[PDB]
C-alpha cells in the first residue's frame, strides 16, 4: 500500500478518545465506549480496504447519533489542519470533529486486511493513488453526509486558496455535502477562501471553481456569500 498504515495503538486511542469525549460532553455519557469501538472495528476488519461502503459504518452511525448547532455549522473540506487555526473558527463554529465520531477519527489512518481479520499497521490505501474507497475516505463521506443533511441557516465552508482547484467537485465536500444541503432548511452557503499567503492580494471569489459553486448552489435554491481571508 502507498499510504501510511493504521496509527499505532489505534484501538487503544480510539477508546481513550471516546472516554474523554464523554467526560467533557456530559450530555453524551450514555455511550458504550466499547460498543462504539466494536462497531467501528467491524466496519473494516474482514473487509478489503478498497471495498468499504457507507453501509459498513451503519452499525457505528447508529451509536454516534448526535445533535448539532445546525446554524453554527462549518462543513468538512479536506483541510482540517489549515482551518482549526483561526480563533474565529474553533470558537464560533462547529467542525465535524467536535462531533463524537469526528472527534474519534480526527488525524487517524486505519485499515485492515481480509485474508486475515487483523488491522494493518504497515501500509494503507492512498485514496488518490490506490483505490478510492479506503475505510478513512469512506468513513468521512459517511459522517459528513449526515452533517450536511443537518445544517440550517447559514452554513459555512473553508477552501484552500492555494490548491490548484479551490473548489473540487469530486471532493467529499463537492460530491457529498453540497447535494445534501436542504434549501428548505439552509438559507446560504458562506464560503471562505483562504489566501495561501499575504502578498497574494487577489479576489479569489473570482476563480472559476468558486463560481462553479456559486452556480451549483443556486440551482439548489440556496444563496451564496463568498469571502477572502488569511
Amino acid at each position, epitope marked *: 500500500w502507498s499510504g501510511p498504515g493504521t496509527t499505532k495503538r489505534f484501538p487503544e486511542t480510539v477508546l481513550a478518545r471516546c472516554v474523554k469525549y464523554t467526560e467533557i460532553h456530559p450530555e453524551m455519557r450514555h455511550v458504550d465506549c466499547q460498543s462504539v469501538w466494536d462497531a467501528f472495528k467491524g466496519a473494516f476488519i474482514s473487509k478489503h480496504p478498497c471495498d468499504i461502503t457507507e453501509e459498513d459504518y451503519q452499525p457505528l452511525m447508529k451509536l454516534g447519533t448526535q445533535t448539532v448547532p445546525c446554524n453554527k455549522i462549518l462543513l468538512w473540506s479536506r483541510i482540517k489542519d489549515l482551518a482549526h487555526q483561526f480563533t474565529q473558527v474553533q470558537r464560533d463554529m462547529f467542525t465535524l470533529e467536535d462531533t463524537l465520531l469526528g472527534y474519534l477519527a480526527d488525524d487517524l489512518t486505519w485499515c485492515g486486511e481480509f485474508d486475515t481479520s487483523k488491522i494493518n499497521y504497515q501500509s494503507c490505501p492512498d485514496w488518490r493513488k490506490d483505490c478510492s474507497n479506503n475505510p478513512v475516505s469512506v468513513f468521512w463521506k459517511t459522517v459528513s453526509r449526515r452533517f450536511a443533511e443537518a445544517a440550517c*441557516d*447559514v452554513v459555512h465552508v473553508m477552501l484552500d486558496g492555494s490548491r490548484s482547484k479551490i473548489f473540487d467537485k469530486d471532493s467529499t465536500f463537492g460530491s457529498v455535502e453540497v447535494h445534501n444541503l436542504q*434549501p*428548505e*432548511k439552509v*438559507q*446560504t452557503l*458562506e464560503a471562505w477562501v483562504i489566501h495561501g499567503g499575504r502578498e497574494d492580494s487577489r*479576489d479569489l*471569489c*473570482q476563480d472559476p471553481t468558486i*463560481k462553479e459553486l*456559486e*452556480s451549483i448552489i*443556486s440551482k439548489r*435554491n440556496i*444563496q*451564496f*456569500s*463568498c469571502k477572502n481571508i488569511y
Partner: antibody
Amino acid sequence: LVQLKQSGPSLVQPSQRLSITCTVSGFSLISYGVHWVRQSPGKGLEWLGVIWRGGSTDYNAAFMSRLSITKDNSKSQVFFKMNSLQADDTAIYFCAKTLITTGYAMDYWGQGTSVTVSS
Amino acid sequence: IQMTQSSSSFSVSLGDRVTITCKASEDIYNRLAWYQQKPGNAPRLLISGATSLETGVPSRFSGSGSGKDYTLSITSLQTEDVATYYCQQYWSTPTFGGGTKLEIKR
C-alpha cells in the same frame, strides 16, 4: 461607504424607452448583485429584475417581454431599460446592493427616481 | 406566492411595544426580509432570513416567525421609528406585502 446613485429621465412619453442608470460607489459589481424594484402607489412594491455579479439575469415573469438590465463593471453602473411604456409604468424605480455575493435581501438601496409616464 | 401584511395602519403611543404580521400563500422556509420605509426616502434593510438583524439597526428590533407567519417587533418604541413596514419573500420570485403604516399616539 456604499452609495447607489441613479439618474436619467423622470418624465417619459407613453410607449417610449425608459432608461435609468444606477451608479455605485464604495463597492463593485463583480462582488455583489443588483436588484431593481419599483413602487407605484397603486401596486405597492414589485420586483422587476436582477443583474447578478455573474452577469446573468432573471426577470419578472411579466416584464421579461420589455426588460433589459445590463451593466458596465469598469465604471460601476447598471442599465435599466424598459420598452413600450404606459400609464401605470409610473412609479419610483430603485436599485439595491444584494446583501452578500448572491442573495435577495438588499442592504444599500438607491435614491429612487420618480418617473411619470405622460404626453 | 403572495405576501399579505394584514393590518395596514397602526397607532400606539411612544414607549409602547408594537408588532406586525406577514403571511404567505405557502411555506417560505424563512426566505423573508423586513424593510422600513420612511416616506421621502429609500427603504431600509432591517432583517433578513426572518431573524438576522443588521448593522446600525437598534437592538430593540425583533425578528421572529415560522412556517407561514412572520413578525416584526419593537420593544420600547421610540420616535424615529415611524414608517410603512414592508415584508419581502424570496423563496421564489420576490413578492412583497401590502404595507403597514405606523402613527404615534399624540
